[PDB]
C-alpha cells in the first residue's frame, strides 16, 4: 500500500475520494460504507462560518476517532473553515472553488495539510489544454512556495465540469498531459448517466490519474481495479 498525506492508501490502483455530506447516523453510515468499499479519502462537506464550523468539526472529530488511519479531506473554500477542520483531524484541504481565499495555502502549510489545487486570439484546441495546465500548475507551485509539502499537493484540472461540456471532454481527452505535469491528478467525473461516467473514469485512470472524487465508491473501485488489472497483471 502507498501513503498519501502520511495515511495508508490503496497501492494497487488509483485512489477514491468519497463525498460525504452532513444533513447524522446517515452521515456516519455514509462514511462506514465508503471505508468498507475502499475509499482512500473521505471528503467531508456540508450560510455562515461560525455554524459551518460547528457542523464539520464534530463530524471530522468523530471520523478521526472511528478511523484513525483514514485520510480525511475537507470540502471548503473558506480558510477559517479549513483551519478548524485541519485541527479537528483533516489531512487534506479540498478547495472546491480554486483559491477564492488567498489565505488558504497558508492554512495548509501551518497545519501540515495537503491542498487540492482546482481549476474553476484565438489559440488552438491544444492551447486550451495548455492554458489549464499552466493555471493549475502555477496554483500548485504557489502552494508549495507557501509551505505546503510538495507531495501533499494534488491538482484538479477539470472540477465541476461534469460529464459533457466541450471543455470537460477535452480535458478528459488530455488527462495524460495533465498527469505528465508530475502532480497527482484528481478527477471529479461524477453526475444511464453512470455508463459514461465509468467510461470516463476508466480512460482517466488509464492515462494515470491518481484520484477520483465520487459519491458511489464501489462502482468506481471496480472500474479502477479492472484498469489496474489490464495495465499491470504480469505474473503468469
CB of 228 to a second copy, least distance (A): 10
CB of 178 to a second copy, least distance (A): 14
Which CB atom, from 32 or from 167, has the smaller least distance to a second copy?
167
Which CB atom, from 99 or from 168, has the smaller least distance to a second copy?
168
Which CB atom, from 73 or from 220, has the smaller least distance to a second copy?
220
Q: State how far the alpha carbon of 115 is from the alpha carbons of 93, 107, 147, 152, in Å.
A: 5, 9, 11, 7
CB of 180 to a second copy, least distance (A): 17
Interface residues toward a second copy, by CB under 8 A: 125, 163-166, 168-170, 172-173, 192-193, 195-196, 198-203, 206, 219, 222-223, 225-227, 229-234, 236
CB of 192 to a second copy, least distance (A): 7
Which CB atom, from 47 or from 234, has the smaller least distance to a second copy?
234
CB of 119 to a second copy, least distance (A): 18
> CA-CA distance, 151 to 183, in Å (whole number)?
8
Which CB atom, from 1 or from 234, has the smaller least distance to a second copy?
234
CB of 163 to a second copy, least distance (A): 7
Which CB atom, from 26 or from 194, has the smaller least distance to a second copy?
194
The answer to whether residues 77 and 95 touch, using CB atoms and an 8 Å cutoff, is: yes
Amino acid at each position: 500500500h502507498s501513503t498519501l498525506c502520511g495515511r495508508p492508501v490503496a497501492g494497487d490502483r488509483a485512489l477514491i475520494m468519497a463525498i460525504v455530506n452532513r444533513t447524522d447516523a446517515a452521515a456516519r453510515d455514509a462514511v462506514h460504507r465508503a471505508v468498507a468499499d475502499g475509499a482512500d479519502v473521505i471528503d467531508v462537506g456540508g450560510v455562515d462560518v461560525d455554524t459551518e464550523i460547528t457542523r464539520l468539526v464534530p463530524f471530522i472529530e468523530w471520523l478521526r476517532g472511528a478511523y484513525p488511519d483514514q485520510l480525511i479531506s475537507v470540502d471548503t473554500w473558506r480558510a477559517q473553515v479549513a483551519k478548524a477542520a485541519c485541527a479537528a483531524g483533516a489531512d487534506l484541504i479540498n478547495d472546491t472553488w480554486g483559491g477564492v481565499d488567498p489565505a488558504m495555502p497558508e492554512v495548509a502549510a501551518e497545519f501540515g495539510a495537503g491542498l487540492v489545487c482546482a481549476h474553476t486570439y484565438g489559440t488552438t484546441t491544444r492551447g486550451v489544454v495548455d492554458a489549464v495546465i499552466s493555471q493549475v500548475t502555477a496554483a500548485a507551485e504557489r502552494a508549495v512556495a507557501a509551505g505546503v509539502a510538495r507531495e501533499k499537493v494534488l491538482i484538479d484540472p477539470a472540477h465541476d465540469f461534469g460529464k459533457n461540456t466541450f471543455h470537460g471532454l477535452l480535458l478528459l481527452r488530455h488527462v495524460a498531459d495533465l498527469v505528465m505535469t508530475g502532480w497527482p491528478v484528481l478527477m471529479a467525473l461524477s453526475n444511464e448517466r453512470l455508463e459514461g461516467t465509468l467510461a470516463a473514469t476508466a480512460l482517466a485512470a488509464a492515462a494515470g490519474a491518481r484520484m477520483f472524487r465520487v459519491h458511489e465508491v464501489a462502482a468506481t473501485r471496480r472500474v479502477l481495479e479492472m484498469v489496474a488489472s489490464i495495465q499491470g497483471v504480469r505474473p503468469p
